[PDB]
Design an enzyme around this catalytic site. Sequence first.
Site, PDB file in Angstrom:
ATOM      1  N   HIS A  57       0.829  -1.172  -0.077  1.00  5.20           N
ATOM      2  CA  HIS A  57       0.077   0.086   0.109  1.00  5.20           C
ATOM      3  C   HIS A  57       0.965   1.252   0.110  1.00  5.20           C
ATOM      4  O   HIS A  57       0.221   2.252  -0.001  1.00  5.20           O
ATOM      5  CB  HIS A  57      -1.026   0.098   1.186  1.00  5.20           C
ATOM      6  CG  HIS A  57      -0.409   0.442   2.582  1.00  5.20           C
ATOM      7  ND1 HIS A  57      -0.330  -0.602   3.555  1.00  5.20           N
ATOM      8  CD2 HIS A  57      -0.167   1.450   3.099  1.00  5.20           C
ATOM      9  CE1 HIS A  57       0.291   0.311   4.538  1.00  5.20           C
ATOM     10  NE2 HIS A  57       0.464   1.475   4.151  1.00  5.20           N
ATOM     11  N   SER A  65       4.653   1.999   8.136  1.00  2.00           N
ATOM     12  CA  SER A  65       4.279   1.108   7.249  1.00  2.00           C
ATOM     13  C   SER A  65       5.446   0.735   6.314  1.00  2.00           C
ATOM     14  O   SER A  65       6.241   1.622   5.891  1.00  2.00           O
ATOM     15  CB  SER A  65       3.142   1.493   6.248  1.00  2.00           C
ATOM     16  OG  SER A  65       2.026   1.650   6.955  1.00  2.00           O
ATOM     17  N   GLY A  66       5.629  -0.606   5.602  1.00  3.86           N
ATOM     18  CA  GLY A  66       6.434  -1.007   4.838  1.00  3.86           C
ATOM     19  C   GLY A  66       7.797  -1.459   5.695  1.00  3.86           C
ATOM     20  O   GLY A  66       8.473  -2.434   5.259  1.00  3.86           O
ATOM     21  N   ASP A 126      -0.166  -7.410   1.395  1.00  2.00           N
ATOM     22  CA  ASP A 126       0.346  -6.130   1.249  1.00  2.00           C
ATOM     23  C   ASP A 126       1.976  -6.273   1.317  1.00  2.00           C
ATOM     24  O   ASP A 126       2.506  -6.499   2.270  1.00  2.00           O
ATOM     25  CB  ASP A 126      -0.026  -5.491   2.539  1.00  2.00           C
ATOM     26  CG  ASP A 126       0.059  -3.889   2.401  1.00  2.00           C
ATOM     27  OD1 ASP A 126       0.166  -3.398   1.201  1.00  2.00           O
ATOM     28  OD2 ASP A 126      -0.160  -3.086   3.461  1.00  2.00           O
ATOM     29  N   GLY A 186       3.395   6.319   9.228  1.00  2.00           N
ATOM     30  CA  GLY A 186       4.885   6.289   9.057  1.00  2.00           C
ATOM     31  C   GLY A 186       5.685   5.353   8.911  1.00  2.00           C
ATOM     32  O   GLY A 186       6.834   5.464   8.738  1.00  2.00           O
TER      33      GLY A 186
END
Lengths: 172, 223
Positions: free
Chosen positions: B40, B177-178, B84, B175
């Site tokens: 995402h 995410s990933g 994701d 902030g």
Amino acid sequence: DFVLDNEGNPLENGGTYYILSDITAFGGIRAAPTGNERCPLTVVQSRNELDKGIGTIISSPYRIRFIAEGHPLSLKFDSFAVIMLCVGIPTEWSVVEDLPEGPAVKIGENKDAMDGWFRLERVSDDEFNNYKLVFCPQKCGDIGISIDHDDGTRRLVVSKNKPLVVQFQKLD
Amino acid sequence: IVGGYTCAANSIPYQVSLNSGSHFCGGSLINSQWVVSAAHCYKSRIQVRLGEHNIDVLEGNEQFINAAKIITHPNFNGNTLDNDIMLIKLSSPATLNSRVATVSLPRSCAAAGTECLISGWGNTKSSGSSYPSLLQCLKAPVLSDSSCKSSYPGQITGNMICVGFLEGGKDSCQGDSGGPVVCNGQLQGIVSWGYGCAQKNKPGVYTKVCNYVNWIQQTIAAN
Ligand SMILES: [Ca+2]
């Protein structure tokens, strides 16, 4: 892409923004009492070109840092002054399925609370940062305005016939 | 990260930052040229910063490199949040060294109670927003599925694990995410989602990387 606030900067995921309208004729979003409510429970739209309404805390369960269009959103009014009969009412925007004027957008605790997420989408003919909110219960339906007949209030509602073009402005 | 603590310098060498105007997500270097992260976080133009500690200051140990390939997993569902995961190909291999290493892909899936380390430069406050300069670290155990599902009924897939505390306090946030969730020198999770942050009865939901070793390993070999 990320949703831009009126100052060309992206919206922070979880920030507080005013939800102004494109047409200067009206104003900002705010809760107001309507019909038979002792508490201001109907997410409305002011008509005064000077009232920026109430601040909303846009946010996504998605941990990204800014708000990207197409991402599930959760809108919530920042704390605002109410009467003693209302201090404590939840502030999250919701959609009560089945009401005369169609699925209305209401705050506070509402039985017929329809499950879904809001989502922003750009519209503007590549000029200002004009968007529109849609509701997609868990396809989607825009969020337009249904004028209170026996009153005049610009009640927020999901209407295919017409959406609501809005533009945000950071609070701070 | 909320409730964590400031990571030491270059404590987590494999951690990166997806920048596109400014920090908006994170990632993890797996080999000199590729970066795995949350799907995402996809964006048309990405600049993969590395060797970062305080993302506001050039300490002269960082390497700014644009992504060339950004392949989000085939079956990723923006709606349901399933799958994701994306791979980013550095348009020029990084220089693996002290301040820039690579995390190992999981040999097997993380068991319940297995302790892990989460990092990111995401929001630090439950209510409100305070974005740090320095990288933040968090120690959290991978919760059982039986428990995870309960907190998010109907939303947990075969590919998401929960990691955190049902009591709130320590969690990830906007902030992060990933970013990585590294367990026992192995990447066992990628920050993806939650409802609020460090809220009670709502741990963070993380993509289960272990279900991606074959995909990752194939994609890199293919591209
Ligand atoms: Ca730096």
